Write a protein that binds this ligand. Structure first.
Ligand SMILES: CCCCCCCCCCCCCCCCCC(=O)OC[C@H](COP(=O)([O-])OCC(O)COP(=O)([O-])OC[C@@H](COC(=O)CCCCCCCCCCCCCCCCC)OC(=O)CCCCCCCCCCCCCCCCC)OC(=O)CCCCCCCCCCCCCCCCC
Ligand SMILES: CCCCCCCCCCC(CCCCCCCCCC)(CO[C@H]1O[C@@H](CO)[C@H](O[C@@H]2O[C@@H](CO)[C@H](O)[C@@H](O)[C@@H]2O)[C@@H](O)[C@@H]1O)CO[C@H]1O[C@@H](CO)[C@H](O[C@@H]2O[C@@H](CO)[C@H](O)[C@@H](O)[C@@H]2O)[C@@H](O)[C@H]1O
Ligand SMILES: CCCCCCCCCCCCCCCCCC(=O)OC[C@H](COP(=O)([O-])OCC[N+](C)(C)C)OC(=O)CCCCCCCCCCCCCCCCC
Ligand SMILES: CCCCCCCCCCCCCCCCCC(=O)OC[C@H](COP(=O)(O)OCCN)OC(=O)CCCCCCCCCCCCCCCCC
Ligand SMILES: CCCCCCCCCCCCCCCCCC(=O)OC[C@H](COP(=O)(O)OCCN)OC(=O)CCCCCCCCCCCCCCCCC
Ligand SMILES: CCCCCCCCCCCCCCCCCC(=O)OC[C@H](COP(=O)(O)OCCN)OC(=O)CCCCCCCCCCCCCCCCC
Ligand SMILES: CCCCCCCCCCCCCCCCCC(=O)OC[C@H](COP(=O)(O)OCCN)OC(=O)CCCCCCCCCCCCCCCCC
Ligand SMILES: CCCCCCCCCCCCCCCCCC(=O)OC[C@H](COP(=O)(O)OCCN)OC(=O)CCCCCCCCCCCCCCCCC
Ligand SMILES: CCCCCCCCCCCCCCCCCC(=O)OC[C@H](COP(=O)(O)OCCN)OC(=O)CCCCCCCCCCCCCCCCC
Ligand SMILES: CCCCCCCCCCCCCCCCCC(=O)OC[C@H](COP(=O)(O)OCCN)OC(=O)CCCCCCCCCCCCCCCCC
Ligand SMILES: *P(=O)(O)OCC(C)(C)[C@H](O)C(=O)NCCC(=O)NCCSC(=O)CCCCCCCCCCCCC
Lengths: 85, 80, 73, 74, 68, 17, 98, 60, 670
């Protein structure tokens, strides 16, 4: 009934797929590091987080906004909190 | 979903998601009580409803059939 | 004498209760503290008492109609 | 869905039942019993309040005036 | 006595033994602990109360001006 | 599945009334 | 130090703008001015003014702080926060004579 | 003015839809036929169109 | 029958709340809703019997207090006013009962909930059906406790807890003044039965009319939130929306209005209270309409609309026109209920979000919900020929009809308040419905576009409308919000209506303005609010979705920044309340219980006497060295001093002073 693995992976995929500043949409996987795999920098990462929480209807505290640096950690972090809609 | 909650906590209002298997006959059992004392109230109400202006016979008047203060008056008026 | 349920007694909370309990032992007379004691024990009740005395028997509403006064003194 | 109602009244678990400490017989038959019986007696206890006595006089008192027409003329 | 601060200003997402109170388990406590917790009168913090009297007065003056 | 009894309280209140 | 907090200012900077401007297509171009503003101070290295730069910007966040920022309901300050709370202790009470 | 470059006029000047942006593709769906300006106001007054037809019939 | 509509709502609530274990969730709903529905059906019958046929009915069950001149009965009187009061109370309570069946199928404690709303219904009938002021105070405090019990229904919300305190404590602040006023009624008349206060009122002293009238004016402020006694209402909206509809939109907050109308035979003999009833009504009319404009919560905005319409209700009371007050009263209740209920289905559509910043679109998603809220808002803004048109607009002409300085002065104040009434009326409609989406995808992601490969079964949830139980009250109120105003215009307003001929609402010919309301007023002023309504709305339509730049430019200006913040934060009134009223109480308690109680009171008392008396006695014990020569010298000294005291013929004061001096040098150490 709650959020599932396939529920979050594809839904979050359509978010960063709209980036014109990534290397390419085909370089995103389950373990795509925000810096090494697809092309993002130290300042774009927080801009993604602003998008993630806005379209997840939650908050990302500054303490937990820094361990989040890869799409793999996004899947495990969101499933940890059942506050997700 | 459903919030977990203790199973030992007896409530008079029921608890968390309370509904017995017999929620119908018990509802019927309680429903008779409400009706039973409602007319019991209605009887006492019909007996103590005091008025001073009498209605016209033509006009629609639901209380002409149970209240006392005008039923006796109506039959008293039916004497000429 | 009986035993109770198990409680996470907080020493900070436990020690805060001790000081509130035992605060009476450390009171002293100061320029501030006598002024507080003097205002709330003397001046304020003297103010109410003065007003109660000065307005006692003064008013009565009982059946005062139009053209008559609430005051009686 | 709707969960079946549960709870342990008086903290007595479903396996066991409530055990008396000995106060119950005195409290329900003695304390509450006496008051309920007293309630029965009070409905028969005669009315001896100053209102009731003064109603009657004042009812006669107004009868020698326009207000409160007396049932029986003198 | 620790600094006399409402728990309104404590971090909500910080690690707390009692999150509902935003207090650590053995955390020291003010002698006004009873009226410095989460269930205390909310402390609004929009502006200094000195400016508040000035801003409300402008509306009052506007009310008096319109009435005139 | 379990059933709730009318309970002694129901009879006391109704009986008292 | 001087890096973790720097991102935090940008974390709230564009968030603060959105809570003032409800129509967020206005906010959409608003972030670019905020974004390019950050990009101007790219290779600033000396902490002496770098710390002072963070102090100065924090002043204007307070100078532009919203009367009531947005929060999601299931969040501190949200509407649904701590609404239907389960009991912290699900185990039944032990046998005691009270 | 300030040690950080921050002009009120320039801050307010950029309050418009940007010609270039890395975010239309994620925000394009809003400005489509589902939520277009014409379609949003298509049902601003639901029964107004139908009511007038009956109103003219009553007059005639 | 007339005593039955008092008992039924009580009976449902006890079974719902005390035997809700034994009737279950659905049984608790069926019992209480039916009890309300049954009470609803008999209420409309009484309106057809008490009012239309002009027969008020009296019920006196038994005595409540009996002390000398004081005989307060558990007695009930139906007249033209109380049957009119019981219509909006009973129609809406039933609908809210149905609305909650859909609303709170997910909330666990659902049968404690349905008992409170039926316990609220019981005490509102008690309030309006009383013979006297004291029995009214039972329904008065009873709805106050029902409101606390509902505001803190989610008692794990700390916010609900503070809100419940504010609602409970603020209403007591007014209930002190109401209770003191009833003490003045008991003092100056010997009773407080309505027949006795009003028959004698035209002869009592003028000054007792003000003192009584003033006290009940403050009491009206607390229930009917006014310019000072209101802080409790906007954050009373922390309760479930069904509560806010029945209680905090239409019924409980007009208790103070009803008291002013009920006491009209009494208050009409002093223009002073009516004067403050007038000016306070406009001041609260404009103070509230301004606040709602800057509110980022739909529940908190529509809460502030309740105060503004409430404010115009008091204004007509000061106009010495209670028939308009009753007419506007009931008419405001019907559509305002729908406005909250319409918002309630909105909150259910989204993931219980309440902020306008993430609302938009939803035109196709909530067609029915949009349609009703527009219908309600149009009557709220007094769009011509609606339920709210006759009731809300007539006020201004009635205000202007009284050709005095005050009447014209508040006409501007009411009109500018009506201007801001339009502004938030479209703001709710625009931001939620007539604007671009501002929430996340899940609020609008339909199933028409695939957009999903293995999650097609779930994850859509695209903010659909509610079920039958949620939509049926919307449709029922929608009809009333369109037609109910016109049907009853002669019933209440009329021109020479004889509906209120049992002295239920007393009006004095010396300040009649009914004929001047229709004739002397110029035509331009009669239609002036219509001009402002149609005009000032389109600027809002022009300022948003057409330009959407001027509002942003005005926001960021230094002058414009503070005016947004100042009005958003409620004129800083609660700031001035918390810091300088309640925190002051919490520190006076702190000074008393630290400096005084566990302080000087002990030091200049037990602890001080304890400490010094222990020292004083150790010193006198120090002389007890048990050496015989020292003891003989003590004996000879006492022998000397007794001779000195006697033959010198000393005055006794020296001996007392010598003893005090010895005792208090023995107190000194060493
Ligand atoms: C009332 C008005 C005043 C209060 C107003 C505030 C409202 C309070 C509501 C009640 C609290 C919550 C109720 C729910 C709850 O917690 O249930 C617990 C629990 C539910 O579980 P259960 O399985 O139903 O009961 C198991 C028993 O406890 C198992 O123990 P038990 O079976 O032994 O319990 C029976 C016990 C109960 O003890 C009493 O009798 C004390 C209560 C007296 C009530 C008033 C008198 C009753 C009428 C007398 C006749 C008219 C006068 O008495 C006895 O032992 C009987 C022996 C004989 C006594 C008399 C001796 C003399 C006889 C000759 C004369 O019920 C009880 O504990 C029963 C007593 C309490 C309920 C009484 C009735 C409440 C009615 C509520 C609705 C109406 C409210 C008023 C109008 C509005
Ligand atoms: C939020 C406000 C709420 C109230 C709204 C306004 C209320 C207005 C009523 C105020 C009231 C009722 C008191 C009842 C209080 C208990 C009732 C409550 C219990 C529940 C108090 O009246 C007091 O007024 C004081 C002074 O006047 C006097 O008290 C003492 O004075 C000194 C003695 O030497 C002491 O120094 C002082 O210490 C005492 O105080 C007494 O005269 C009197 O008892 C009556 O006021 C009235 O007093 C009379 C005589 O004055 C006056 O009438 C006028 O007389 C002609 C000129 O002669 C005029 O030609 C005529 O036109 C007018 O008729 C007015 O004054 C009038 O107003
Ligand atoms: C007459 C003076 C009456 C003063 C009563 C003092 C009572 C002190 C009890 C302390 C209350 C404890 C509490 O936390 O309540 C918080 C409550 C809640 O207020 P709050 O501001 O903290 O609520 C915050 C709301 N949220 C969380 C959403 C931001 O405040 C009060 O109850 C104090 C106001 C009392 C009623 C106001 C009376 C003023 C009368 C004006 C005319 C004179
Ligand atoms: C549930 C409601 C059941 C009660 C309905 C009572 C009723 O319908 O009125 C009865 C009335 C009979 O009166 P009658 O002698 O026929 O006078 C009219 C002659 N043409 O029937 C009538 O024909 C009179 C017209 C109906 C009564 C007026 C109805 C509208 C009243 C205003 C709205 C009241 C809302 C509350
Ligand atoms: C067991 C548990 C269950 C029962 C619980 C108790 C129930 C009863 C509760 C009592 C409450 C009062 C209600 C009952 C009223 C009964 C009064 C009564 O017993 O009669 C009065 C009795 C006789 O009256 P009288 O002859 O006038 O006495 C003159 C003495 N010089 O007066 C007397 O003199 C009696 C003398 C003997 C008693 C002393
Ligand atoms: C054409 C004629 C010329 C027009 C322009 C002339 C200049 C303005 C007229 C003179 C000033 C009148 C007083 C109004 C005022 O000054 O409001 C300012 C006040 C905030 O004060 P401010 O110093 O600007 O804030 C700095 C914070 N860093 O703002 C506020 O706090 C708002 C409080 C009042 C709001 C009530 C509604 C407006 C009332 C208008 C008066
Ligand atoms: C709980 C709801 C209680 C319902 C009322 C119970 C009794 C209903 C019958 C009313 C009645 O006939 O009188 C009630 C009784 C006597 O009251 P009283 O004022 O003396 O009436 C005669 C006037 N001389 O007075 C009473 O019985 C008091 C009511 C019970 C107290 C609780
Ligand atoms: C005058 C007519 C101006 C109409 C402007 C309001 C309509 C446009 C509008 O919707 O403004 C809304 C905005 C607050 O809404 P927001 O949540 O910030 O998002 C925008 C949603 N439209 O509201 C705003 O941003 C502020 C726009 C209105 C500001 C009005 C300030 C001048 C009036 C102050 C009171 C003057 C009267 C003082 C008292 C006189 C009587 C005593
Ligand atoms: C009320 C008394 C409050 C009080 O403080 O009494 C204490 C007083 C002196 O003791 P204290 O100064 O407190 O101890 C030294 C601390 N530095 O201790 C005292 O002075 C004791 C006062 C009691 C009077 C002695 C008994 C007199 C009996 C009559 C004697 C005359 C015949
Ligand atoms: C006219 C008056 C009529 C009679 C009323 C008064 C009678 C009581 C006073 C005389 C009682 C007889 C005892 C005299 C006495 O005790 O005096 C000795 C006293 C001892 O005190 P001190 O010397 O300081 O002790 C340390 C030793 N080196 O030496 C002193 O210096 C005296 C100081 C303390 C006095 C205490 C007196 C006894 C207790 C009272
Ligand atoms: P990646 O980008 O994460 O690397 C970050 C680095 C390590 C380069 C740091 O940014 C850094 O060390 N840079 C130099 C020091 C620094 O922190 N610079 C960042 C810019 S500070 C600055 O320019 C101050 C103002 C910032 C913008 C504030 C905007 C606030 C809101 C304005 C609008 C309010 C009303 C809506």
């Amino acid at each position: 009934e709650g959020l599932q693995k396939v529920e979050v992976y594809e839904r979050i995929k359509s978010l960063l797929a709209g980036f014109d500043k990534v290397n390419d949409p085909n370089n995103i996987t389950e373990t795509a590091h925000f810096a090494n795999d697809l092309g993002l920098d130290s300042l774009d990462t927080v801009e993604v987080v602003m998008a993630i929480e806005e379209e997840f209807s939650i908050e990302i505290p500054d303490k937990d906004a820094d361990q989040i640096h890869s799409v793999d950690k996004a899947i495990e972090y969101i499933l940890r909190q059942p506050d997700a809609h | 979903p459903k919030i977990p909650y203790p199973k030992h906590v007896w409530s008079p209002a029921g608890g968390w998601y309370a509904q017995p298997a017999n929620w119908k006959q018990n509802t019927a059992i309680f429903g008779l009580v409400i009706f039973g004392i409602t007319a019991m109230v209605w009887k006492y109400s019909a007996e103590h409803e005091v008025r001073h202006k009498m209605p016209e016979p033509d006009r629609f008047y639901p209380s002409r059939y149970w209240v006392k203060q005008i039923k006796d008056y109506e039959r008293a008026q039916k004497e000429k | 004498g009986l035993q109770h349920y198990k409680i996470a007694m907080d020493p900070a909370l436990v020690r805060l209760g001790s000081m509130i309990s035992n605060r009476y032992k450390y009171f002293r007379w100061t320029k501030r503290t006598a002024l507080v004691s003097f205002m709330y024990v003397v001046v304020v009740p003297s103010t109410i008492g003065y007003l109660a005395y000065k307005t006692d028997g003064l008013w009565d509403l009982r059946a005062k109609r139009r053209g008559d006064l609430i005051s009686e003194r | 869905q709707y969960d079946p109602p549960t709870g342990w009244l008086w903290g007595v678990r479903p396996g066991e039942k409530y055990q008396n400490e000995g106060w119950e017989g005195p409290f329900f038959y003695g304390f509450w019993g006496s008051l309920i019986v007293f309630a029965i007696a009070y409905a028969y206890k005669p009315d001896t309040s100053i209102q009731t006595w003064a109603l009657e006089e004042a009812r006669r008192r107004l009868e020698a005036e326009g207000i409160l027409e007396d049932p029986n003329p003198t | 006595n620790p600094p006399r601060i409402k728990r309104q200003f404590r971090d909500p997402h910080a690690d707390w033994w009692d999150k509902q109170e935003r207090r650590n388990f053995g955390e020291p406590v003010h002698e006004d602990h009873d009226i410095l917790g989460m269930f205390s009168p909310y402390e609004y913090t929009w502006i200094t109360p000195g400016k508040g009297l000035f801003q409300i007065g402008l509306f009052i003056a506007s009310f008096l001006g319109l009435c005139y | 599945n379990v059933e709730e009894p009318l309970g002694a309280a129901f009879y006391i209140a109704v009986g008292g009334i | 130090s001087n890096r973790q907090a720097a991102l935090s200012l940008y974390r709230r900077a564009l968030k603060l703008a959105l809570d003032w401007t409800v129509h967020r297509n206005l906010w959409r171009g608003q972030a670019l001015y905020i974004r390019s503003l950050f990009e101007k101070n790219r290779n600033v290295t000396d902490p002496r003014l770098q710390r002072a730069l963070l102090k100065e910007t924090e002043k204007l966040l307070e100078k532009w702080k919203h009367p009531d920022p947005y929060c999601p309901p299931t969040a501190p300050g949200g509407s649904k926060y701590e609404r239907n709370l389960p009991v912290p202790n699900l185990e039944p009470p032990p046998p005691l004579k009270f | 003015p300030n040690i950080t470059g921050f002009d009120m006029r320039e801050f307010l000047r950029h309050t418009k839809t940007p010609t270039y942006d890395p975010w239309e593709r994620h925000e394009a769906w809003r400005y489509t036929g589902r939520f277009s300006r014409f379609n949003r106001f298509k049902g601003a007054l639901p029964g107004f169109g139908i009511a007038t037809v009956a109103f003219t019939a009553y007059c005639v | 029958m007339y005593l039955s509509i008092i008992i039924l709502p009580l009976l449902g609530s006890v079974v719902s709340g005390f035997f809700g274990r034994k009737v279950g969730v659905s049984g608790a709903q069926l019992i209480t809703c039916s009890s309300v529905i049954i009470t609803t059906i008999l209420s409309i019958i009484a309106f057809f019997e008490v009012g239309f046929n002009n027969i008020p009915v009296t019920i006196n069950i038994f005595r409540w207090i009996d002390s000398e001149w004081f005989i307060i009965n558990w007695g009930f009187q139906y007249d033209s006013l109380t049957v009119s009061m019981l219509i909006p109370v009973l129609i809406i309570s039933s609908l809210v009962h149905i609305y909650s069946i859909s609303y709170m199928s997910s909330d666990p404690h659902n049968q404690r909930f349905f008992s409170y709303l039926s316990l609220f219904t019981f005490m509102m009938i008690i309030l309006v059906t009383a013979n006297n002021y004291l029995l009214m105070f039972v329904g008065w405090e009873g709805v106050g406790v029902c409101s606390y019990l509902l505001v803190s229904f989610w008692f794990t919300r700390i916010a609900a807890n503070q809100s419940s305190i504010s609602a409970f404590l603020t209403n007591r602040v007014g209930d002190c003044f109401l209770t003191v006023g009833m003490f003045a009624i008991l003092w100056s008349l010997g009773n407080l039965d309505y027949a006795t206060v009003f028959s004698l009122a035209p002869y009592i002293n003028s000054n007792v009319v003000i003192i009584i009238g003033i006290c009940l004016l403050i009491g009206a402020m607390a229930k009917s939130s006014q310019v000072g006694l209101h802080v409790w209402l906007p954050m009373a909206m922390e309760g479930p929306t069904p509560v806010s509809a029945l209680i905090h939109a239409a019924t409980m907050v007009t208790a103070g209005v009803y008291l002013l109308m009920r006491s009209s035979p009494l208050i009409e003999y002093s223009s002073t209270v009516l004067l403050l009833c007038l000016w306070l009504g406009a001041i609260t009319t404009v103070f509230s309409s301004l606040i709602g404009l800057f509110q980022q919560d739909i529940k908190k905005v529509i809460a502030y609309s309740t105060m503004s319409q409430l404010g115009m209700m008091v204004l007509s009371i000061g106009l010495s026109s209670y028939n308009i007050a009753l007419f506007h009263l009931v008419n405001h209740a019907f559509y305002k209920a729908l406005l909250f209920l319409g918002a309630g289905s909105v909150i259910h559509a989204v993931a219980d979000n309440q902020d306008f910043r993430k609302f938009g679109g939803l035109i196709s998603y909530l067609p029915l919900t949009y349609s009703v809220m527009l219908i309600a808002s149009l009557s709220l803004v007094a769009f011509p020929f609606m339920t709210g048109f006759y009731s809300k607009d007539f006020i201004l002409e009635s205000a202007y009809g009284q050709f005095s300085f005050s009447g014209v002065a508040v006409y501007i104040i009411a009109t500018i308040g009506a201007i801001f009434t339009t502004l938030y009326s479209v703001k709710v409609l625009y931001l939620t419905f007539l604007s671009n989406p501002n929430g996340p995808r899940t609020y609008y992601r339909l199933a028409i576009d695939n957009f999903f490969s293995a999650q097609a079964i779930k994850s859509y949830k695209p903010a659909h409308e509610g079920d039958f139980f949620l939509t049926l009250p919307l449709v029922i109120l929608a009809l009333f919000s369109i037609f109910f105003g016109f049907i009853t215009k002669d019933i209440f307003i009329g021109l020479g209506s004889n509906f209120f001929v049992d002295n239920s609402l007393f009006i004095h010919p010396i300040h009649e303005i009914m004929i001047d309301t229709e004739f002397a007023v110029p035509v331009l002023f009669k239609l002036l609010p219509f001009i402002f309504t149609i005009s000032f709305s389109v600027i809002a339509l022009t300022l948003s979705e057409l330009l959407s730049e001027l509002v942003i430019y005005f926001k960021f200006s230094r002058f414009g920044y503070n005016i947004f913040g100042f009005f958003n934060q409620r004129f800083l009134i609660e700031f001035f309340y918390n810091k300088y009223i309640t925190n002051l109480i919490l520190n006076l308690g702190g000074q008393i219980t630290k400096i005084l109680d566990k302080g000087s009171i002990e030091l200049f008392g037990p602890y001080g006497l304890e400490r010094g008396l222990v020292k004083l006695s150790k010193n006198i014990s120090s002389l007890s060295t048990s050496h015989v020569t020292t003891y003989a010298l003590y004996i000879l000294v006492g022998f000397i001093l007794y001779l000195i005291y006697n033959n010198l013929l000393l005055d006794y004061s020296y001996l007392l002073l010598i003893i005090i001096l010895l005792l208090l040098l023995m107190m000194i150490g060493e």
